[PDB]
Amino acid sequence: QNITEEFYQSTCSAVSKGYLSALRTGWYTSVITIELSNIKENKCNGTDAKVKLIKQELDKYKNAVTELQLLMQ
Amino acid sequence: QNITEEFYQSTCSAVSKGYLSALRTGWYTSVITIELSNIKENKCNGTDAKVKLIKQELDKYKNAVTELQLLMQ
Amino acid sequence: QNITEEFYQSTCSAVSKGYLSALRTGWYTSVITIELSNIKENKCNGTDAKVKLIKQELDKYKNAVTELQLLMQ
Amino acid sequence: FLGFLLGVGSAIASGVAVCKVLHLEGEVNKIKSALLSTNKAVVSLSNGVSVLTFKVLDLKNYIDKQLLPILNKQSCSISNIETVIEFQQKNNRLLEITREFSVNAGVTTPVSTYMLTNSELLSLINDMPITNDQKKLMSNNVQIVRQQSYSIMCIIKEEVLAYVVQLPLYGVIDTPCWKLHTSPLCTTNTKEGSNICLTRTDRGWYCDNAGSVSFFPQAETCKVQSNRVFCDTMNSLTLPSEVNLCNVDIFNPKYDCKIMTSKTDVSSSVITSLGAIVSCYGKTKCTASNKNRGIIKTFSNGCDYVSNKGVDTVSVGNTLYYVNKQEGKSLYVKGEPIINFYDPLVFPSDEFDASISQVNEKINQSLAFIRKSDELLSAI
Amino acid sequence: FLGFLLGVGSAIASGVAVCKVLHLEGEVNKIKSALLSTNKAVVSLSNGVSVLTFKVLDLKNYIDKQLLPILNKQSCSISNIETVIEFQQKNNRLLEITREFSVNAGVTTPVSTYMLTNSELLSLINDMPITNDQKKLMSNNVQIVRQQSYSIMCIIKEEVLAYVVQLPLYGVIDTPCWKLHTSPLCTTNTKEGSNICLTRTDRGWYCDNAGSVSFFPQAETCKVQSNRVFCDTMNSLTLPSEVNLCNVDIFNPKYDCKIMTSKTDVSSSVITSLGAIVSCYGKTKCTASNKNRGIIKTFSNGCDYVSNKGVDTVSVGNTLYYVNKQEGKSLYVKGEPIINFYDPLVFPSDEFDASISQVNEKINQSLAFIRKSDELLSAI
Amino acid sequence: FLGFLLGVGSAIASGVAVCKVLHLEGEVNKIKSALLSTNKAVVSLSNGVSVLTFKVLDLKNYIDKQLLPILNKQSCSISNIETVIEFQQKNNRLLEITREFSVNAGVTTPVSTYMLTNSELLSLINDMPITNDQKKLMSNNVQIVRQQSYSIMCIIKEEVLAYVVQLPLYGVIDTPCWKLHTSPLCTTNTKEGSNICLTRTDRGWYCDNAGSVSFFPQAETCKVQSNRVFCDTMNSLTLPSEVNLCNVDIFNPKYDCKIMTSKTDVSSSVITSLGAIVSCYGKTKCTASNKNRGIIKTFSNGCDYVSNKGVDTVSVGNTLYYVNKQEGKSLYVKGEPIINFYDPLVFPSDEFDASISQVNEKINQSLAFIRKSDELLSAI
């Protein structure tokens, strides 16, 4: 890198040179998909462990789908 | 929906018609309350499981109350 | 607190007095450091519990270091 | 352009007014006492204001059923089932509310799902004293409602955490709206610096409101749902109905149309709802192209327009503009550019807040004091 | 209005200056070596700068006590107690710091609790070389301090992660402050377009600072705590004490008061600290009302004012403004609107950056070259 | 200053165009069918557009291997190992994507790691039809790429969630760039109000682009990486190469340099890349100081400059400015301040959008109609 500067007493201005461009000229569109599963409201009376953590995450999953559906079109 | 547009060569302007209003004219204020519990600094020497997860969440609860109290008035 | 106000009919202006200053005049810089550990990609075939939660957090740790390294200089 | 003409309000003045009342000695008690078993209670405060109070999260009654039976007696002992989980999900909401109020210094916008859930939000809309048309508008556009909402942290008097949620009131619905897009109109004659420009400053959103027209100078303040325009009256001006006459006739005697004059003949483009306005001046390469087949139209010097039908992109100099692909019908209204009617020798070249008649008055004053002074020296 | 007159600084120039020094070959070592056992060390860098270094999170020494004893020997084996939790809470801070630096490209504002905790923040304030009055100001307004703070990511040289936290220095405290609210002042005469306007551009925050007055043109840059005004000197101008004389006397010989002239007689409202300024012009419906009893005052054409005492809302056209309910004392200073003193026939109608004397000079130049030219033709 | 001269585009017009096509009856099916086993497929839509489709997260196939075998048969039963964890980490991404789209009403910027991971982002860059120089530029500056990116939520047709990620295309790379810093230039003569000012409005970023120069009026729109300038062409003007001649010669016949004239002789500072421009006027205390030794230079009235070499701070009135410590070479080009060449008696004191020749033309018009009218009365 070689950044240089010049001040002009006559016009009260300064020019900072030695920079390189990276201008956004256009766009690149890509469809990003997430495969979701429609699940029935079935239940189990279990459990000592693990499934109780899995049902909470499954209820959080349903809440996420509900909010995304609420976003309309 | 029936969105239409007209360009005016004489004035270098365009008018996009066929839109419907939804202007915020006023406000609706509602008090939202969360009932909190003041807890004493008591301890237990347990445990194999569960209570160690509950104490961490109780310490996170105290930290949340501390930050909210720090917000002054 | 003693906030007072005066309206001027002649100039269509108002002055709100009785306020106290707290202007940022300068800065205070301080280096904040977090000691990180470089870890080898070693493995274990365990476990029933606990270590499986610790490896997930260790993989999240590596991902955090990767993103911070990606930030360049 | 005309955003400087707007007034200046206080967005959270209504919310803070409720917070200031809640700070009183016996005001906190009235709130807590009314919400004994019920989670929704319309509490009338000491000053006389009627506010709908909501008990969203009960951490005290939850702690009282997992601290008092637990702690006992000699030492803390173990917990069973998924019940503890219930604490992790309940406490998470409080932590998120705290994080939000901490970074935003007590005032948050938009209102998050942690601050007010969809179930709690839709309940408030149904309990609001508003029309059925307004209720369905809010219910179908919750994310916009949340974006136009504020959450103000008021008190942390013990045993309760209170915060006011300022929700929008849509008094104007289904009335016709229109967006005005304007671009500079300059003379095309060849010598550089000899050219004069004209631009309509009156661009922005326009909506029919109570016999008048609500004008939004900063089109960014409005949100488009592809049919419905979500605006805020705070960022508007109340103009007479005759303002729309400027589009069909700029020299109309009913309304004095607002213009801006300059000599800066710089090329640019205004991407409209159903196309693109192209202001081509000087040695600029202005073009309209279809992505599949390349360049379809090369713009000549002056102000032109292209419809979104068949045109995907518009290029003005080194700037590429993607045209909006919203389905609609466009119409090119042919007419002589007004700038040609003005004499460049006697033209106000530096006007920022002028009108079509103010310029005429400035020309009339110039033209008269030029001819009268010419006849004065002619008698030498 | 006058925000364009401001200079242009580099907010993070001080923070980046420290980052640039830390990039040196032996600079990282000096930091790590000094923080051997202590979590706070004032490390003097190679260039000569004295910086307070803080070791907030020790993940290396924590991993060295759960990787080296664990891994051994043949294969990884199981963990006991709540000790693992300690890793989840420690790693969470790092993940949040990373997420923040990722989205904000190394520079974050406000400074979060994950970036610097309340305990760590209050420790720095106590160790800062500042007055006890400044320490109590920062300690009671941590959220504002965080909002006016920056966090710059510098290096990830191995075995340490370093980032500079740029904290505000409040050199000016407890000095008197005042906010100036201005609205357009136009003539009321009936024919449309014949009216002339005048507006004081000098609106914003004003604070007494070192024999001078610090002027903040963009009132948004300042934060009000209901008594204390939190401002940034970067967004200010240093004006002489005589600037306040403009409020009591606009035609004062000591200071040349700044004004803006137009013909745009558009209705609007300026919500003040203790009331509302109402600029009513044309066919607009300007009103002041109490929510409990409806309309209490109907404004006539011109510029008027209403106190926050008894007035909850102000309506100007289709715009409803909620008045600030802050408790205070208002005073209506009666006086003839200046705009009446100027002759509309000879008045500069298009001035954006003018003053009370610049307009007089423009009138004097016009009035003289009108009368002298009139007497010239009178001798025909 | 010249940001008002810019055009107006539609940032997400390209992304929404893809969303609108995906809403069709058989368009969703084509996407889902092509991604049968492969996670990357270039699906050609019904209209004819070629888009690269990505399957980032498979929750359906994961649920189908933990719901169908589990549920069976009589009732739900227990889960083994760390497999459940896999669900917590997979579902967390969906929850974060949802939270982001909820608060930002379907359109997010910057693009988060949850929306598109570093591994997925770097894969798209390698599959993009672009040069190897562009690929390395994006790969080394992912955080900037993310900041200049958009994520638009399109459809939630069942069994799939689709959203368009709008990524930047850097068509211009490694071309020379330069930043112009301007400050007001006023006369220094003692009587207050008698002084005239001049300011170059043409400040901002300038980059060489296809035989022309891309001008960025709002320097905030550009991002500096200490060597590379990341800009957006949407916020630019296409100016001829001759624009740079204004720096070496303001009165050049090739390009008409843009200026702003006033009488407001207010003191301020412009912090440059390698120093500071100081505009000192009136009774202001303007100074340059080294932190270690205090005050090193006291500025006299007028416009001066100091290099970043040895100068840490610059003070203008009550405002302290930290100078950028970027290593470089500065040069003071000595020259008579132009403002001295103009006669204050005949000078346009209120110009916002003027040029060096427009002022000369305004003076020539004044000077001629002053002398000719003087000779007219001289023959009395």
UniProtKB/Swiss-Prot annotation, chains A, B, C:
Q: Which residues form a coiled coil?
A: 51-71
Glycosylation (residues)? 2, 45
Q: Where in the cell is it found?
A: Virion membrane; Host cell membrane
UniProt protein name: Fusion glycoprotein F2
The UniProt function text for this chain reads: Major determinant of the species specificity of RSV infection. The trimer of F1-F2 (F protein) also facilitates the attachment to host cell by binding to host heparan sulfate. F protein is involved in the entry into the host cell through the interaction with host IGF1R. This interaction activates PRKCZ/PKCzeta that recruits host NCL/nucleolin to the apical cell surface where it can bind fusion glycoprotein F1.
Subunit structure of this chain's protein: Homotrimer. Heterodimer with fusion protein F1; disulfide-linked. As a heterodimer with F1, interacts with host heparan sulfate. As a heterodimer with F1, interacts with host IGF1R; this interaction activates PRKCZ/PKCzeta that recruits NCL/nucleolin from the host nucleus to the plasma membrane. Part of a complex composed of F1, F2 and G glycoproteins. As a heterodimer with F1, interacts with host RHOA; this interaction facilitates virus-induced syncytium formation.
Highest rank taxon of the organism: Viruses
Instruction: Note the residue range shown relative to the complete protein.
Output: 26 to 98 of 574
What gene is it encoded by?
Answer: F
Q: What is the lineage of its organism?
A: Viruses, Riboviria, Orthornavirae, Negarnaviricota, Haploviricotina
